[PDB]
Ligand binder design. Structure first.
Ligand SMILES: [K+]
Ligand SMILES: [K+]
Ligand SMILES: [K+]
Ligand SMILES: [K+]
Ligand SMILES: [K+]
Ligand SMILES: [K+]
Ligand SMILES: [K+]
Ligand SMILES: [K+]
Ligand SMILES: [Mg+2]
Ligand SMILES: [Mg+2]
Ligand SMILES: [Mg+2]
Ligand SMILES: [Mg+2]
Ligand SMILES: [Mg+2]
Ligand SMILES: [Mg+2]
Ligand SMILES: [Mg+2]
Ligand SMILES: [Mg+2]
Lengths: 117, 203, 122, 50, 155
RNA sequence: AUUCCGUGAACCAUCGAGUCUUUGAACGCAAGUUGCGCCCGAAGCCAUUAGGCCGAGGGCACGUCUGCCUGGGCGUCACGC
RNA sequence: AGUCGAUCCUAAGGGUCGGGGGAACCCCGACAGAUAGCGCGUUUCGCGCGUACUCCGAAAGGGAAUCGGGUUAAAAUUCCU
RNA sequence: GCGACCCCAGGUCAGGCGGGACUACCCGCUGAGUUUAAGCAUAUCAAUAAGCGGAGGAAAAGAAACUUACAAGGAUUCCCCUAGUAACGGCGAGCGAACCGGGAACAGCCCAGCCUUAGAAUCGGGCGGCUCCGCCGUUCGAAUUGUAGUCUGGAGAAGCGU
């Protein structure tokens, strides 16, 4: 054997991927954050109604754990409407609120009428 | 028929052969960490007589401990008290060095049970013991009737409760009679029993 | 119109999932009614729908767990969630056979000189 | 301050929710002993001490 | 590990070795060792497969052949206990001791015992080689108690 | 709500089935941060012995025991060159 | 709020592996040591480099990117154009 | 260059174990002073409080390297007595057991070493079966630097009879 480096380096040895005999968890967990759990209920305040009328935007109360991507996906699944952009904030009461602006192809007033506000 | 030969040779500790071997071994141990597993015992006969068996689940760890007394660990060697307690040096730990070694092994290896230990080597600075430990979770141990008692919960941390051979030695349980009666069932238990003031219903 | 657990137990997984989806949609509609100022009759249905959702979920979970237990029956190395819980110390305990293990001399002593049945009268 | 951590904000939200009078119908319950909310807090009287 | 195993050899070389340990540095010559070991290769103990085959043959033939007599096997003996017992009982005819037994207190007295019992002994290189002889990872020592008629002269 | 002569009310009792959020000995790294990483992967989109997007969900701490795989050192030897 | 900040970097320092002490709670802190890994081509294996912490530590230090105009009872370089 | 062994290294390798929590009792360590002595330093407070660890339903102890000096008792533990005694103590203040005797309960045992060598008879894992806290078959591995079996001083090995 010929060594050109004075420093000794640990040789590379094979590693094996885990192949457990039994699964630690019997079955995959349930999807807690589904679309129904993501979308709690729409907001029916005066400001929300003004947003719907003017900016073609819906106002929703959403699970605090939900992100903008999940909110967009849940809105699409629930109401079959595209979203131009989702803005989010956490109210002082601790709940998450989302302003979801629909694309021009969709009418916020018609969507709200279908929802039932 | 060889263990007797080995035992007598190890009894002859001042012989040239033993001195050479112990010198080499002490040098080698000085270069390694304080606690280190050994593949097999270096005193097979002593391990046998202390309860080691050459089967799966038995392990041996070499433990190195510092020599000397116990200096009172007070800052600047200052004692706030009476002259009788003002002493700092020349104070002695109530436990033995082998007990310290077993405690270190047991604390380090929380998943095993310390069965026993024995002296192997020493220099002016260090004393060396080998501790025999048992993996109570192994099927061989659990199915061996002579040792599976160690798996019962009452034997947890024997070394830390002083239940090993060294534990009994330093607790004063290796003798019986007028010279040792105060240590049974324990020194503190005897003190409590003796100090108890019994006030019966009918006095 | 009320949900019966014994009736749910006779349904399949797909039917139970469809019923769960319908109940979730109804619960969402009831929440919308509540936030828009629904009448007390609509408001009272929230408890019923939530109970129905919980019942359906429980039936699904019990069926799945029974299936998993049957699949893992007569097998070693079960999943931890399916292994018996008991307590930590009880789980660590030695088995009855291991407790009863003894040496050959002890077995011979028990076989040769057991405690005899005797009386003192004559 | 305007800069606040998420955990502190959530704790403040909980405190705000807890700071309210008791429902009126609580006083009409059979064998009721609650007269008012004994744990009411005012931002100027007692500080949260966070 | 490398540094310490090299320094151990250096220290053993530097320090004076008492004669009892020094006697283990003089092993059997190459030619003599090769002859002895080629002799030993034909007295190896049966392996697990051979033992199982012989046991099943004996079980099959027990009732049918009415337990026919079988010649006593002639094989090398191993295991420190058994070797020491044979030496003490004067049944051993040749003793072979590995030169690299660790701890060496196990066999440091064996040459003295063999000399006292008038049993010829040799110190050879390789407990691993002895173990290979006896189908084991290592063997502290081996012993021959008897040899075959065709091999008595060379023995 | 309840065939209230009944698979049946209950802010009833009891327990075997099941669910059980963020943490905490707390375990990928941290923390006055819902901050910063890596790995596997159901279903779906078009993509066809080819790979892409997404992601349900789950993994990656330390010390140890048994067994195993992959390796290092003339540390002890042997066979060849 | 992709554009304002945290988030990223490191400062004084803090917290650590191994090692050394310690009855032990713990103490020193990369100092007693087979480091993390990083590039090239690929039958995913080979080749070449590889000085023992790729951790915390700044809403005033360093630093990727937004501007008008308009709009609310209360928000905006975040909402509308 | 190959092979055997030794020691060690890396594995999110297959399967296991450990950490922490509670306080009345229990086990180990460490450890004061207030106070008493009409002052005070040895002593006392106290082998205590505080501090650091480790268990269970009890823990610990336990089958004599004992007590005794007798016409002898016979593991350990606890109660009564011994006894405020022997002893210790600026022999000051104070401190202070044990044996016998009477009761509660009672239980004895397992190893190491010389002793298969006509073959490790021992044990663990995987796989396949079964009346599945275990048994059987097969295959790998551990182990001769010793797993099983016999033996533990009260004995015991070997031999001969019942
Ligand atoms: K004093
Ligand atoms: K950070
Ligand atoms: K240490
Ligand atoms: K360090
Ligand atoms: K900054
Ligand atoms: K603008
Ligand atoms: K087997
Ligand atoms: K034995
Ligand atoms: Mg290096
Ligand atoms: Mg003091
Ligand atoms: Mg360390
Ligand atoms: Mg960084
Ligand atoms: Mg006990
Ligand atoms: Mg009296
Ligand atoms: Mg008595
Ligand atoms: Mg098996």
């Amino acid at each position: 054997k010929i060594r050109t480096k004075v420093t000794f380096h640990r040789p590379k040895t094979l590693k094996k991927d885990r192949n457990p005999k039994y699964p630690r968890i019997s079955a995959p967990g349930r999807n807690k954050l589904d679309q129904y759990g993501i979308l709690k209920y729409p907001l029916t305040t005066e400001s929300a109604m003004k947003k719907i009328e003017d900016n073609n935007t819906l106002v929703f109360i959403v699970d605090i754990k939900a992100d903008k991507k999940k909110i967009k996906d849940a809105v699409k699944k629930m109401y079959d409407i595209q979203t131009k952009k989702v803005n989010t904030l956490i109210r002082p009461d601790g709940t998450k609120k989302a302003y979801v602006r629909l694309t021009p192809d969709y009418d916020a007033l018609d969507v709200a009428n279908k929802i039932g506000i | 028929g060889a263990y007797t030969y080995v035992s007598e040779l190890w009894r002859k500790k001042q012989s040239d052969v033993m001195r050479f071997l112990q010198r080499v071994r002490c040098w080698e141990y000085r270069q390694l960490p304080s606690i280190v597993r050994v593949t097999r015992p270096t005193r097979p006969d002593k391990a046998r007589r202390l309860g080691y068996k050459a089967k799966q689940g038995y392990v041996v760890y070499r433990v190195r401990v510092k020599r000397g007394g116990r200096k009172r660990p007070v800052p600047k060697g200052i004692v706030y008290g009476k002259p009788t307690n003002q002493g700092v040096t020349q104070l002695k730990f109530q436990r033995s060095k082998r007990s310290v070694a077993e405690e270190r092994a047991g604390r380090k290896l929380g998943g095993l049970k310390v069965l026993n230990s024995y002296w192997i080597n020493e220099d002016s600075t260090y004393k060396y013991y080998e501790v025999i430990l048992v993996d109570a979770a192994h099927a061989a141990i659990r199915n061996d009737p002579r040792i599976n008692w160690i798996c019962n919960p009452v034997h947890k941390h024997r070394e830390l409760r002083g239940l090993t051979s060294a534990g009994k030695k330093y607790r004063g349980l290796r003798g019986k009679g007028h010279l040792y009666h105060k240590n049974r069932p324990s020194r503190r238990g005897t003190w409590k029993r003796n100090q108890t003031l019994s006030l019966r219903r009918y006095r | 119109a009320r949900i019966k657990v014994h009736e749910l137990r006779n349904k399949t997984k797909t039917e139970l999932l469809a019923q769960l989806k319908d109940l979730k949609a109804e619960l969402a509609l009831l929440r919308v009614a509540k936030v828009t100022g629904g009448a007390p009759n609509k408001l009272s249905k929230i408890k019923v729908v939530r109970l129905s959702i919980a019942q359906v979920l429980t039936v699904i979970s019990q069926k799945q767990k029974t299936a998993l237990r049957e699949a893992y029956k007569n097998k070693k190395y079960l999943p931890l969630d399916l292994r018996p819980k008991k307590t930590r110390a009880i789980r660590k305990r030695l088995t009855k056979h291991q407790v009863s293990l003894k040496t050959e001399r002890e077995k011979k002593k028990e076989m040769y000189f057991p405690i005899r049945k005797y009386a003192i009268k004559v | 301050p305007s800069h606040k951590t998420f955990m502190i904000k959530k704790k403040l939200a909980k405190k705000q929710r807890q700071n309210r009078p008791i429902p009126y119908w609580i006083r009409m319950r059979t064998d009721n002993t609650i007269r008012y909310n004994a744990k009411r807090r005012h931002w100027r009287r007692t500080k949260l001490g966070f | 590990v490398v540094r310490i195993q090299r320094k151990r050899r250096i220290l053993k070389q530097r320090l004076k070795v008492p004669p009892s340990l020094n006697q283990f540095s003089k092993t059997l010559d190459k030619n003599l060792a090769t002859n002895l070991f080629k002799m030993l290769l034909k007295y190896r103990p049966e392996d697990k497969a051979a033992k199982k085959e012989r046991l099943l043959k004996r079980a099959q033939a027990e009732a049918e052949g009415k337990t026919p007599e079988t010649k006593k096997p002639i094989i090398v003996k191993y295991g420190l206990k058994h070797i020491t017992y044979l030496i003490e009982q004067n049944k051993a005819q040749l003793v072979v001791i590995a030169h690299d037994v660790d701890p060496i207190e196990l066999v440091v007295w064996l040459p003295a015992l063999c000399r006292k019992m008038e049993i010829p002994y040799c110190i050879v290189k390789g407990k691993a080689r002895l173990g290979s002889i006896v189908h084991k990872k290592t063997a502290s020592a081996l012993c021959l108690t008897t040899v075959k008629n065709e091999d008595k002269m060379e023995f």
